[PDB]
Amino acid sequence: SEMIYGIHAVQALLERAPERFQEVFILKGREDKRLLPLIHALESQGVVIQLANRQYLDEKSDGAVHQGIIARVKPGRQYQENDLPDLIASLDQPFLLILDGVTDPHNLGACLRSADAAGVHAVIVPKDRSAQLNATAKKVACGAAESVPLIRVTNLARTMRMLQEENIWIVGTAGEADHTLYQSKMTGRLALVMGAEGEGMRRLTREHCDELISIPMAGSVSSLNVSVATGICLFEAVRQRS
């Protein structure tokens, strides 16, 4: 049993895994047009709602910015490297995001938020030397933690080959690319790879890519933050995929 607080986590679950709802706790006495459009959905879902004072919610959350809402939820299905091939098989047209070198919990959250926004089916990351999904990541993820699975993998190159033996085209961003993000084809079976802000993808990672793209800069000094680069690339795909 897991405890979630916040409207962004209560809702990401209503949109994605409403079946994970067991019992809801909301402030007994304080109307908010920020909750009814949720309270009703919960009622429609057949989720048992429960009346509780403010103390009942100040304790069972460790003084969090619950905004008046907390629920009892069944832990979310955590995908391991092993069950990736099945996840992919259940996908009509895989749209994946691979992060090589994201060590900062905050960036992991931002990338997760954007992947969700983009409709990415899963975020794949190097099990070793990569940030962890802690309180802060989830927080910056704005609920994305609950929607987009994050699969931690032993060897990136091995997993990439698996994806390629499964017809998923791998396109990675890199300065030493010959064409730009806009001269790429981001339709079909796809996996987008972003590397750390300074070092980029590790040499091995970029060699396991079918293609390499670069984001065009207007300034030989102009650079881009990682979570913004991820977004720009992901939505260029969203654009071509619509």
The reply on whether position 223 binds its own copies by CB under 8 A is yes
By the rule CB under 8 A, 118 interacts with its own copies: yes
Is 229 a binding residue for its own copies by CB under 8 A? The answer is yes
Instruction: By CB under 8 A, tell whether 90 contacts its own copies.
Output: no
∠ CA 201-143-2, nearest 5°, is: 110
- 215 in a known ligand binding site: yes
User: 161: helix, coil or strand?
Assistant: helix
228 binds its own copies, rule: CB under 8 A: yes
Q: Which of 48, 129, 204, 216: binder of its own copies (CB under 8 A)?
A: 216
Closest alpha carbon to 108 in 134, 139, 131: 131
Choose between 160 and 181: whose C-beta lies nearer to its own copies.
181
Q: Is 212 annotated as a binding residue?
A: no
Q: State the Cα–Cα distance between residues 185 and 113, nearest whole angstrom.
A: 24
- 215 touches its own copies (CB under 8 A): yes
Nearer to its own copies, 130 or 230 (CB): 230
Site for its own copies in 22-41 (CB under 8 A): none
Of 46-54, 59-67, 201-209, 220-228, which segment contacts its own copies by CB under 8 A? 220-228
Going by C-beta distance under 8 Å and a sequence separation of 6 or more, which residues neighbour residue 126?
100, 101, 152, 153, 156
Least Å distance, CB 14 to its own copies, is 9
Check residue 79 for interaction with its own copies (CB under 8 A): no
Number of residues that bind its own copies (CB under 8 A): 39
Using CB under 8 A as the binding rule, the residues of this chain from 144 to 203 that contact its own copies are: 144, 147, 182
Pairing of strands 69-73, 2-5: antiparallel
Output Rg (C-alpha) for the chain, integer angstroms.
20
Which tokens is 209 given? 């890519």
Q: Which amino acid is at 153?
A: V
Query: Six-digit token pair at 226?
Result: 């990682």
Helices of type H across the chain:
7-15, 36-45, 55-59, 84-89, 105-118, 135-141, 144-147, 156-165, 203-207, 226-240
Tell me the binding residues.
195, 215, 224
Binding site for its own copies (CB under 8 A): 8, 11-12, 15-16, 110, 113-114, 116-119, 142-144, 147, 182, 215-225, 227-232, 235-236, 238-239, 242
Tell me the binding residues for S-adenosyl-L-methionine.
195, 215, 224
